Design a binder for this molecule. Structure first.
Ligand code: MG
Ligand code: MG
Ligand code: MG
Ligand code: MG
Ligand code: MG
Ligand code: MG
Lengths: 257, 257, 257, 257, 254
């Protein structure tokens, strides 16, 4: 799946690619699960080699944040929910070269789907690959903050089930919920920590235009403010786990009598 | 619910608003669950758009602490107890523009009720929106310190109940109490951490008059001194939880014999 | 209970007060649970208002370490054991004004009782309110170190009971002891952390004579050296708790067979 | 087992040693479980004493990272899996002297086997003992990152077994798996922490050619980026352990009824 | 028990003290559980008052690392095993005054026995009280590292045991014994670290000694993390075992 976009008065406009062949006009090429036809197309029409599937699995800093003849690379985790409502992080490879952004990903993602909806009716400022990459990160952070906001309200409800329920039915269900919330928080944190590394890397490496620099700093400031929330949930979740076991042991004593 | 206040020799005096229409004389406009009539009134009489309900839910730094054409914004958690004695944090949107403070909130709050009682018979110093915002924060911290002081004495009593035990139904009751105290501490900490971000933001952003700057620093110094107390209570609470489970297991062994 | 002391060749000498009325000659006035007669006496004979009972309950920094027209104030936790051998921390309000020290406290305290015994036959160096305040702190630290030393030996003995006992009688008793030791350590730590704040405050605030400054630094160095011991005991205590539960579960399995 | 290598246009080429005796041409001598014949050979043909078996067991810094008349020594843990699929760390003694690298090890190791396979068809840059040592470390890190990547996917699967399963068969198996994953992470961390010390030592000690210095820094940057992942897995593992016990206690209550 | 040593070409040689009375020639006086005769002897023959029994119990920095008219004092924990193989830390009072080292201790200790064995047949470098004190510390650290090395291999074996029986009472006991050793090893390290930081700032240590002290500090910095790593493992194993016991209990009930 190849989509391509070009700039028209600081507005991202979707190029037609199946028909209008010239990719050279694009500022952003976005690949989703691309076949070897789409990869070869990008290879010949632009200069661009793209990361292979197994190289997006690598977690080492030097494998994720680096510069080479193929440009500036940032591999970042993006958060999503699979078909059965289970959280995950999918790695996305960002590459910037000759003022163009390339995004390569294994799947559809809510930050991208959201950015693209908005991009249809919203001007960029400086209008360049770096602003665009940071815009995708801004959107990612906005969505992680929503996730956290939801863990809070779910944990609030679940806290009351744990104080007020005693049946076994309500309690199997409670530990499962707790475990699902821990997992989301955990994945959210991986997502934040990685974005944070990525942004620190760019601040030191790219000659980011000054408008971009402030933007990146704003994003770093948001991450600094969400991480503590993450840690706060893990304390609550662990405490609730402990309390439940307490209630189960008390119940068991009742039963034995 | 719209209340408005004005200054008379550095004393906050309540304006009559249902009758005396001129709001322009007010230094502080305080809205509680305002209908669209009250919002429109503020909009036309002063320049002021106010945050919507869903924007007070956003927890990201950039959504809470920011400057724009509508002024300087600080969204801060305030602590309260709902009808059934369950702790919570309610977000309050502070806005300062043209030397006036606007507070927008979802509910009545004890810090506000307390500040207002005192404001009746107590002079301000410099007499301005920034002092006023910091006064509300001073008051908030004073109350969070009281909360913590109370968790201490409650935990002290509950500690003794747990050493006797010697179980039914003194022990169901003991874990419930523990769990209520953990939750208050937890919510107190969120409240402190957020006030701390807000105050760090203001120290860097507003041209705070020097009298205000010291005031802000004093409040930050207090938060620095309360956070450790918070962390201390979690250690105790977690240990007590562990001990109780110990006593329950010992009891269970007795029963089985 | 009002006692007063005066200096005679750098020696603190108890000046009889029921008879010899002139309090002006005293360097140190020490009140324990003073009635309104003793408070009024200090108020009229010296310039001195004294903190009320509820103000000694406040735990925020600005309520404990501050300067005002009534002088320099330090409120510090002191460690003690109540009638039923339960550890506690009692707040003592220190005030220095016009070269005189005022101590106000709710109860007898072992540091004070000890300092006073020694003061009968021991010269001070510079002979002033600040030295005197730091001497009381030195004594406090000496006693907290003794507490910790004792938690170690008690925990050593209890460690052996936990490996070698199996009866239920010996194990109720073991968890209780553990819980008692955790509580002492916990209260010791609060006592240290607070003294540490107090001393940091003085180092920056009072024009401490240079002999006093070194003294304060020595005390801070001691606290830096006791805090780690405190943290070490919590690890042990927690581990022992876990082991005991292990033994109880093993025992329970034996019983069921 | 003695292997030796020499440089030919920055390409490591395996010398024949059973036949072609001259070892003086080698840049790298690699010993695996060497007999006293192979040790004596290295001793006489080059100047080189080699660490004894018990000296590779010493874990203090001064025993692992040091310079002496026999050259520059680095003893580093390398990760492996024994015959029964149990993780372990084997110490390898690196020595550099007169532009030659000596590696002494107790066993075959996957980093070495991998480096050697690649070395057959891949040019070095500067072509020296220090580059070579850092290449082996680069390889080691690449493999530790693979390990961590695998703990993640295994923990992902195991997380779902723990939420969905009730049978005892699936749960014995689940704790065992958890315990195996904890042990790998644990050993991976020891391996990283030690490599980190080693590289910090070299950065301060060897006159590393500038191309090597950047290489070492790149490796340090990767370790800084993997350690947090390690800590993240322990939190998950510990939580899952707790949850499982919860489910077992719930099951036990069912059984008793 | 009074032993005394003197220097002969940078070699520590044991003086005869029951017979050859002159103590003034000694560089190192080592007392173990000394009676008031041996204390008075040191008091009169040299200038030296020695710490009392209860003052070696004090754990406050100011009670352990300090300078006064009786010289430079360092009280440090040393690791040992009592008669029933139970780990402990015994405080040793080091005092340096007029180029002489005094050690006062409650008991025999393996670092001291080891140092003395070696001191027979091994030259010192600069040959002074400060080198001698640091040599005793070097030896102490060498032994703590051995302890940790052993907790590792024991924990490795015990890990496998933990993956019906009488084997499980035994396993928790072993775990608890290993936790205790690690714990005591840490106390020993943390204290030595405080002592060495104190000396670096306080004594006019000759430059050869300064590097020596820094080497020792570097070793401690490298052992402490190992200590913390073992507690994580030990705590986890404890948790796992309880898991297995609960699973077993469920089997039984069925
Ligand atoms: Mg890889
Ligand atoms: Mg949102
Ligand atoms: Mg636990
Ligand atoms: Mg208060
Ligand atoms: Mg050794
Ligand atoms: Mg003492």
């Amino acid at each position: 799946m190849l989509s391509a976009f070009q700039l028209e008065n600081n507005r991202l406009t979707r190029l037609e690619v199946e028909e209008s062949q010239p990719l050279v006009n694009a500022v952003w090429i976005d690949l989703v699960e691309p076949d070897d036809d789409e990869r070869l197309r990008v290879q010949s029409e632009l200069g661009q080699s793209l990361a292979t599937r197994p190289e997006l699995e690598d977690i080492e800093a030097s494998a994720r944040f680096f510069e080479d003849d193929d440009g500036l690379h940032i591999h970042s985790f993006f958060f999503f929910e699979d078909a059965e409502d289970h959280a995950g992080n999918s790695t996305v490879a960002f590459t910037i070269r000759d003022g163009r952004l390339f995004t390569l990903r294994e799947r559809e993602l809510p930050a991208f789907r959201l950015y693209r909806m908005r991009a249809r009716s919203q001007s960029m400022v400086d209008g360049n690959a770096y602003e665009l990459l940071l815009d995708l990160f801004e959107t990612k952070i906005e969505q992680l903050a929503d996730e956290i906001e939801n863990i809070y309200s779910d944990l609030e409800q679940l806290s009351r089930v744990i104080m007020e329920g005693h049946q076994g039915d309500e309690y199997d269900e409670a530990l499962s919920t707790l475990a699902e919330l821990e997992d989301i928080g955990w994945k959210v944190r991986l997502c934040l920590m990685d974005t944070q590394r990525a942004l620190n890397f760019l601040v030191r490496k790219a000659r980011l235009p000054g408008g971009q620099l402030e933007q990146a700093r704003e994003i770093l400031r948001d991450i600094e403010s969400l991480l503590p929330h993450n840690e706060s949930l893990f304390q609550k979740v662990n405490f609730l786990m402990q309390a439940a076991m307490g209630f189960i042991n008390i119940e068991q004593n009742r039963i034995i009598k």
